[PDB]
Design a protein around this ligand. Structure first.
Ligand SMILES: C[S@@+](CC[C@H](N)C(=O)[O-])C[C@H]1O[C@@H](n2cnc3c(N)ncnc32)[C@H](O)[C@@H]1O
Ligand SMILES: [Mg+2]
Ligand SMILES: [Mg+2]
Ligand SMILES: [Mg+2]
Ligand SMILES: [Mg+2]
Ligand SMILES: [Mg+2]
Ligand SMILES: [Mg+2]
Ligand SMILES: [Mg+2]
Ligand SMILES: [Mg+2]
Ligand SMILES: [Mg+2]
Ligand SMILES: [Mg+2]
Ligand SMILES: [Mg+2]
Ligand SMILES: [Mg+2]
Ligand SMILES: [Mg+2]
Ligand SMILES: [Mg+2]
Ligand SMILES: [Mg+2]
Ligand SMILES: [Mg+2]
Ligand SMILES: [Mg+2]
Ligand SMILES: [Mg+2]
Ligand SMILES: [Mg+2]
Ligand SMILES: [Mg+2]
Ligand SMILES: [Mg+2]
Ligand SMILES: [Mg+2]
Ligand SMILES: [Mg+2]
Ligand SMILES: [Mg+2]
Ligand SMILES: [Mg+2]
Ligand SMILES: [Mg+2]
Ligand SMILES: [Mg+2]
Ligand SMILES: [Mg+2]
Ligand SMILES: [Mg+2]
Ligand SMILES: [Mg+2]
Ligand SMILES: [Mg+2]
Ligand SMILES: [Mg+2]
Ligand SMILES: [Mg+2]
Ligand SMILES: [Mg+2]
Lengths: 238, 136, 95, 335
RNA sequence: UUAAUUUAUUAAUGCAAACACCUGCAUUAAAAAUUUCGGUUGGGGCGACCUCGGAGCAGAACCCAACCUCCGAGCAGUACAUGCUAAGACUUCACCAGUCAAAGCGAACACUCAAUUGAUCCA
RNA sequence: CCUCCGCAUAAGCCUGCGUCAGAUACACUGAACUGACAAUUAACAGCCCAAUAUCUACAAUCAACCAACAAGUCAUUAUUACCCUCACUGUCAACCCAACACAGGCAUGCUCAUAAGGAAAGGUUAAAAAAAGUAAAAGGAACUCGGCAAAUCUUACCCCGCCUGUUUACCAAAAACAUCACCUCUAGCAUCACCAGUAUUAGAGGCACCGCCUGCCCAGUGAUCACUUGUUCCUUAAAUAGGGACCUGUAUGAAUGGCUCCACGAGGGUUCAGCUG
RNA sequence: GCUACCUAAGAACAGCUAAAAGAGCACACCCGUCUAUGUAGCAAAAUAGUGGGAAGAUUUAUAGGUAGAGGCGACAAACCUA
RNA sequence: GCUAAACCUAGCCCCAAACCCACUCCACCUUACUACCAAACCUUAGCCAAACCAUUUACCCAAAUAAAGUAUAGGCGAUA
């Protein structure tokens, strides 16, 4: 239809961007997803999920200073504004990240496993086995996709030959190249799950529309009856 | 395909959950080499005729045992009147013996405790049951 | 039946009648007995003979069959070796 | 069917037979639902010697021959031969064929069904009655003895008596089935007393029963059908009438056998007790029940018996020897 | 929906083609689609019944007692000319079906039974 | 005497009670009817903008304390380019959507009772029945399906549903739906939904706050460990019954049921006291 | 252009009590519990009284979207121009 | 004697023949009738008939007639 996505920005900025609500509709205009509509207006803060992004005409490990740690409407986790050189960007804040903290981003894989400080982002090869990690990439230089919800931590289980097994928070193992970068520690806003919505009105503010009033028989189907077995059903007590 | 077909049958046809499927694979690896038709039939047998819910099948390691053995034990008990299939409501007049004391136990132990019959009676019953399945 | 065709605007023959009946030119219709091929093992020789017969139809039946066939089927035919040739004309019939 | 008739039989039997038999009921229950063991009764009019040899090749043994040997450690009906397999053998006899003479070699029937016939101590030149002959089996065995001067076959249903004619024709020659030699009737058995009294040396009475074996398996024309529920209720009454009717027809000093296919003591013991009581009051005729302890003892090898019956003998099915239930009570008319 | 007929659609699988996708074929599921829901029995549940033969039952040619009350039948046995043909007739109130039969040819010296049964198409 | 209306803007309509002259759903020979003539004048409002890069973390609430959560309504710079001006359009009315000059529907500002806007009675009489009010001796629910209506303004409960909320526009507002919380199932992932999200997430569902009880088909005895048993192979014609391996990196079970309870309800029932035609 | 839901950018909410709220009383505003009137009516659903809510899962103006084998739905088989 | 009644001709119908239309100026795809700026091709289905319905059930295609409702087709039914 006349739907145009709000996601038009081509240049990264730290300025909050005006975003348009979907209502769970498509470009076509029909609903694809139910229970979405009309919360508090929100502004999008663009997040650089690529922690190892060296500045223009710069290369190698770089350090950044945390300017502030801030609430974000668009995600469960808190975000941090971080400054390095002449660049400011938004990143996902860790559990223990404060203003004034200094964080390092390196692409250096160490022969001897480097000490893993909470704020820093390192390749999985550099990181010791058993370290709590977050903001992992499936492919080298792809960007963080995997552990970015509030209070979520992955575990680097083992490191074989240029490969690393990590445990996603759903207790599912994933194969990742050692060259891929992850952020150490747990994500901010622990005990987010412990929050109490309290009233129906709060979910409406969060933009969640109420569930359908229609009664469904069962979420799962009934087991299909095989050819000889039917007499064994619908036994009546007397 | 062989592995994929097995897990599909359990998830879709047998309506086992992902967690339950994994446990079945962990505990009964013999299901994979087993024919799909036979595996489906075995599940159908426990679910309807024996009136066993999904969690119990997985826990009691039912799919481990051979289909032949299941028939001999259950039909004997059912015909003895000791085992009664659950109704539509699911309630039974006399509680059914547990699969622990049916399949897990030996032939001798089953007859002594559950079946409450001599061995010679059960031996001749095997032959009759074996014949019945031949005509099908 | 089709009294008037969409293509030609003509009366149509019912082809069922042609498959089952013979018209003699004199106006009689000939038919086989029903069930003459059926279950002969359980039937008496007398009954079997009765079944293996070519029998004429009622006036009412003849009138029905006439209406269900066009004039073509009612024409005089001079077939080269016709087994029913002699039966086409009536002899010594009074009213 | 919305609700199977065979299910009603299971429900009915479970509530009554469990209390009747106790721990024995499970054993009986499994046997009833399992496949029936069959005995081959050799046709005497056929080549008895050749068939006996043939069946012996199949490792079948004539139990009645063995029974006669151990009888003398009255006498049973002679000229009866029934081959059955050993205990714990599930072997089936091959289907019977016509013989050289044109009569079938053997008849496949329940071995327990012969016991009422054997209980009746048939003697040559005896006038014998069978009130409920159809479809056959028992009445065929009567003819096999060859001790029947005059045999009367009766059954209420002409449908079932037609089946008997087919059995009689196939097994018994026309010579044996002469005029008044074998009489076949389709009349009511209850009114037999007034028809003819003090006629028969021996009467076999096989009343309609719940047909425990048959009711569990065969759905068609099941007695446990809700349409036939009224028949079941009046069945104990009807059974007494028939047994009484048989007693009237019997000459004083004569013997009758009451055979029932059911486990129920209602249709077994109370019917016998009731018939004696009815006859003693209404007609002032005394009946003495003949003990069959010796008879049960002889046939322990082939058949297991339920040793708790006040009157008569009940054969219970066992999974070892799956012979259909048979309650036979032999009694003599004193007056 | 556990009614019948489908899988055109979607998804997966296998086999071809092609050197993963696409195409053709087949199989399995989901999702639907088209169509129907005979008759008697207060009405409803549990039942019964629908065709053929017999009796109450037309007192005496034929026919005729709905509904009801009862019974039965859905075979079987003996031949193996239970071959062929053909006057005249009967007929379940129509038709379709069904029934009897002289003479003749050929043989020999058109069976018993109350019903014991099924058109057309099609194979 | 009324004013619960008015004045203006927006939206809608489009000359639809101005002048003159005529014929003629109460009527004025006058009408809003017919014909002719006239009129709404921009400052208000509409109608905007050279290009390419680049900039834009810090709400609003008297914005100061204080306190947050649902996280928010308004910012540029550098270089190039640039010199002509007040054009065009709305401006009326007693007005729109409801077939009508319809007790209806209709956004905003100001006036919160008017400085603005209107008239319930065509004339008479004072019957019945009908409608709306006012007053009523003594009694105070005796009425009735029911304290419906009115008067009076009230207690203590029971059932149901936690609650605020939603629903059959036009016969059902509820005990139905939703709902916090809890539980089940499904999913390891980018450039058009979910989502510029990522398992403390998202979707599909169940139940309905909280609070208190309700939880094993994990192999049995005996003294972590031996041993038949369970599962798989082979020998055995093949079996019976013998030879070998494993069950020791972990398991929890209920979209289960009951139980009171605070608050609340135009819910259904009972009740105290008063009160009233 | 009604209505169900959504999107964009807007607007409205007096006074009184309250440690301060999907709080209470209560205007405007939204709705429609109960009764009476009306039943070719003022009205193809209205009027008067009495009621429920009235800072919010609130009410409402403007423009846009979803279309019938469909949409939309806090499921009433609701609403999608009487 | 009121209301009324009465009328004949605008035009139309079927054929035949013949192959029709198309700028005063100005305006008109944006909110049409507003002078003036950075992408089309794609099996019709169904009612209906078959006394239900499920395969099936005439519908122009190159000019009369006749072959002929014939050969054929078809729950070999209806019908084509
Ligand atoms: C259980 S069967 C007899 C079994 C048979 N003798 C056999 O061994 O195969 C009883 C028979 O008696 C018949 N019957 C029932 N009532 C009867 C009566 N009043 N008079 C005569 N026969 C009767 C039944 O129709 C049935 O055929
Ligand atoms: Mg969000
Ligand atoms: Mg629900
Ligand atoms: Mg006739
Ligand atoms: Mg008649
Ligand atoms: Mg002759
Ligand atoms: Mg004018
Ligand atoms: Mg201006
Ligand atoms: Mg004024
Ligand atoms: Mg007035
Ligand atoms: Mg007046
Ligand atoms: Mg009055
Ligand atoms: Mg008063
Ligand atoms: Mg009262
Ligand atoms: Mg009171
Ligand atoms: Mg009263
Ligand atoms: Mg009131
Ligand atoms: Mg008053
Ligand atoms: Mg509520
Ligand atoms: Mg509220
Ligand atoms: Mg409420
Ligand atoms: Mg509403
Ligand atoms: Mg309503
Ligand atoms: Mg209402
Ligand atoms: Mg509810
Ligand atoms: Mg309420
Ligand atoms: Mg919005
Ligand atoms: Mg206020
Ligand atoms: Mg409030
Ligand atoms: Mg309030
Ligand atoms: Mg709604
Ligand atoms: Mg409902
Ligand atoms: Mg409904
Ligand atoms: Mg409409
Ligand atoms: Mg039709």
């Amino acid at each position: 239809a006349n739907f145009v996505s709000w996601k038009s920005r081509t240049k990264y900025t730290i300025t909050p961007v005006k975003m348009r609500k979907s209502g769970g509709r498509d470009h076509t205009g029909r609903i694809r997803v139910h229970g979405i509509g009309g919360g508090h207006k929100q502004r999008y803060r663009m997040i650089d999920f690529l922690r190892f992004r060296p500045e223009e005409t710069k290369s190698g490990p770089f350090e950044e200073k945390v300017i502030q740690v801030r609430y974000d409407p668009c995600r469960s986790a808190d975000i941090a504004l971080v400054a390095g050189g002449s660049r400011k960007r938004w990143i996902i804040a860790t559990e223990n990240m404060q203003a004034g903290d200094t964080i390092l981003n390196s692409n250096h894989i160490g022969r001897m496993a480097v000490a893993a400080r909470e704020g820093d982002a390192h390749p999985l090869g550099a990181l010791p086995v058993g370290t709590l990690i977050n903001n992992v990439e499936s492919e080298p230089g792809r960007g963080a996709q995997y552990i970015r919800a509030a209070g979520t931590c992955g575990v680097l289980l083992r490191k074989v030959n240029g490969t690393a097994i990590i445990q996603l928070p759903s207790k599912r193992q994933m194969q990742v190249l050692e060259t891929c970068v992850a952020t150490v520690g747990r994500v901010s806003n622990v005990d987010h799950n412990k929050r109490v919505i309290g009233k129906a009105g709060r979910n409406r503010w969060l933009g969640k529309r109420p569930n359908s009033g229609r009664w469904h028989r069962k979420g799962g189907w009934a087991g299909r009856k095989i050819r000889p077995l039917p007499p064994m059903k619908s036994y009546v007590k007397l | 395909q062989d592995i994929n077909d097995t897990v599909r049958l359990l998830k879709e046809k047998c309506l086992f959950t992902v967690q339950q499927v994994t446990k079945i694979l962990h505990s009964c690896p013999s299901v994979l080499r087993e024919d799909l038709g036979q595996l489906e039939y075995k599940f159908q047998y426990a679910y309807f005729r024996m009136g066993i819910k999904h969690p119990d099948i997985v826990k009691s390691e039912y799919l481990q045992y051979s289909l032949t053995k299941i028939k001999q034990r259950h039909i004997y008990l059912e015909r003895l009147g000791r085992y009664q299939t659950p109704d539509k409501k699911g309630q039974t007049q006399i509680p059914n013996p547990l699969l622990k004391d049916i399949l897990r136990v030996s032939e001798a132990e089953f007859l002594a405790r559950t079946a409450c019959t001599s061995v010679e009676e059960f031996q001749v019953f095997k032959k009759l049951l074996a014949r019945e399945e031949e005509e099908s | 039946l089709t009294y008037f065709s969409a293509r030609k605007g003509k009366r149509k023959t019912v082809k069922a009648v042609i498959d089952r009946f013979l018209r003699l030119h004199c106006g009689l219709w000939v038919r086989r007995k029903a069930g003459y091929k059926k279950k002969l093992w359980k039937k008496t020789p007398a009954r079997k003979k009765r079944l293996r017969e070519f029998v004429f139809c009622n006036k009412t039946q003849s009138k029905l069959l006439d209406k269900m066939t066009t004039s073509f089927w009612k024409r005089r035919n001079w077939y080269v070796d016709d087994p029913y040739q002699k039966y086409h004309d009536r002899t010594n019939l009074k009213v | 069917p919305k609700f199977p008739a065979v299910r009603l039989a299971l429900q009915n039997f479970d509530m009554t037979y469990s209390v009747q038999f106790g721990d024995l009921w499970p054993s009986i229950r499994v046997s009833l639902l399992s496949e029936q063991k069959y005995g081959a009764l050799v046709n005497n009019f056929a080549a008895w010697d050749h068939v006996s040899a043939k069946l012996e090749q199949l490792s079948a043994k004539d139990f009645v021959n063995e029974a006669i040997s151990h009888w003398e450690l009255w006498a049973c009906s002679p000229n009866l031969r029934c081959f059955t397999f050993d205990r714990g053998d599930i072997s089936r006899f091959p289907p019977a064929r016509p013989g050289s003479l044109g009569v079938m070699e053997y008849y496949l029937m329940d071995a327990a069904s012969l016991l009422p016939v054997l209980a009746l101590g048939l003697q040559p030149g005896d006038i014998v009655l069978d009130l409920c002959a159809a479809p056959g089996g028992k009445t065929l065995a009567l003819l096999q003895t060859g001790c029947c001067r005059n045999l009367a076959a009766n059954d209420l249903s002409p449908s079932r008596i037609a089946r008997l004619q087919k059995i009689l024709h196939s097994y018994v020659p026309e010579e044996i089935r002469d005029g008044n030699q074998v009489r076949v009737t389709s009349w009511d058995g209850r009114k037999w007393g007034e028809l003819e009294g003090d006629t028969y040396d021996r009467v076999l009475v096989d009343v309609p029963c719940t047909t425990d074996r048959h009711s569990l398996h065969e759905e068609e024309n099941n007695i446990f059908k809700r349409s036939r529920k009224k028949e079941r209720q009046i069945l104990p009454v009807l059974q007494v009438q028939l047994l009484a009717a048989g007693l009237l027809a019997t000459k004083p000093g004569g013997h009758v056998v009451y055979s029932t296919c059911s486990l129920s003591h209602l249709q077994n013991e109370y019917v016998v007790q009731g018939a004696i009581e009815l006859l003693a009051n209404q007609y002032s005729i005394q009946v003495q029940v003949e003990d069959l302890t010796h008879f049960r003892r002889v046939f322990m090898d082939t058949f297991c018996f339920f040793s708790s019956c006040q009157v008569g003998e009940l054969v219970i099915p066992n999974l070892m020897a799956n012979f259909g239930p048979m309650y036979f009570c032999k009694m003599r008319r004193l007056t």
